[PDB]
């Protein structure tokens, strides 16, 4: 997930990026390549929840993008699905 390669030829497969660095504020950029598979077979996040029976899944959800990725779709779908 934290994959940023300096080699500049294996760059198109790098995962972490740096958008803009205006002083104190850094703008990182994570790819949702397999995290939220919209029209694909099966996702990373689905196996984190539906398939993995390992104890470490509590820690494994506490990685950087997924703590904010889950807050994305919660803010868009939580208030709607509750009201229904």
């Amino acid at each position: 997930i934290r994959l940023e390669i300096k080699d500049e030829e294996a760059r198109h497969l790098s995962r972490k990026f740096r958008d803009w660095a205006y002083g104190p504020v850094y703008s990182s950029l994570y790819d949702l390549s397999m995290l939220d598979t919209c029209g694909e077979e099966v996702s990373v996040l689905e196996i984190l929840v539906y398939n993995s029976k390992v104890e470490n899944r509590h820690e494994m959800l506490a990685v950087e993008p997924i703590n904010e990725l889950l807050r994305d779709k919660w803010q868009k779908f939580g208030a709607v699905s509750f009201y229904i």
């Binding site: 205006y22 002083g23 104190p24 504020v25």
Partner: protein, 157 residues
């Protein structure tokens, strides 16, 4: 070349030898550096503002040269003091950018040629987080230099 797209590139390239003969070229076609077209129609980003964005180790030799070309046209208080014309990055000048990237050598160059100290970067980006912006500093370059953990500009201002 003779267009704007060549000029906005080479400044980011930082090759002053590829910018030769343009000061007599404005003598021919009577054009100012910030007349209509050598400035972004969406934002207002000029050549000097573009010069401070892309840096070569924090050094671009076009920066005194763009002031030099502006001196012959007579826009030293205009080519430096032209803020952004957009809404989101509204009011940001080249003085705000040079303080931002800690070009202490270039901060001294702007004011000596004439720079508005009290230019307010009052854009929607420069608002606090409750208002929709990402970074707040009170819209002032003196306050900006204090917010960038740099007292050296603070001594200079």
């Amino acid at each position: 070349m003779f267009n704007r797209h060549m000029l906005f590139d080479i400044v980011s390239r930082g090759s002053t030898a590829e910018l030769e003969g343009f000061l007599p070229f404005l003598l021919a076609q009577k054009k100012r550096l910030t007349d209509e077209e050598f400035r972004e129609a969406s934002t207002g980003k000029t050549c000097l503002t573009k010069a401070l964005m892309n840096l070569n180790g924090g050094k671009n030799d076009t920066i005194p040269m763009l002031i030099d070309i502006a001196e012959k046209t007579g826009n030293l208080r205009e080519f430096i003091n032209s803020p952004f014309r957009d809404v989101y990055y509204r009011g940001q000048t080249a003085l705000h950018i040079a303080i931002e990237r800690r070009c202490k050598h270039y901060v001294e160059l702007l004011v000596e040629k004439g720079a508005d100290v009290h230019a307010q970067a009052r854009g929607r980006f420069f608002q606090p987080k409750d208002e929709g912006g990402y970074f707040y500093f009170g819209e002032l370059p003196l306050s900006l230099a204090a917010c960038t953990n740099q007292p050296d500009i603070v001594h200079y201002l």
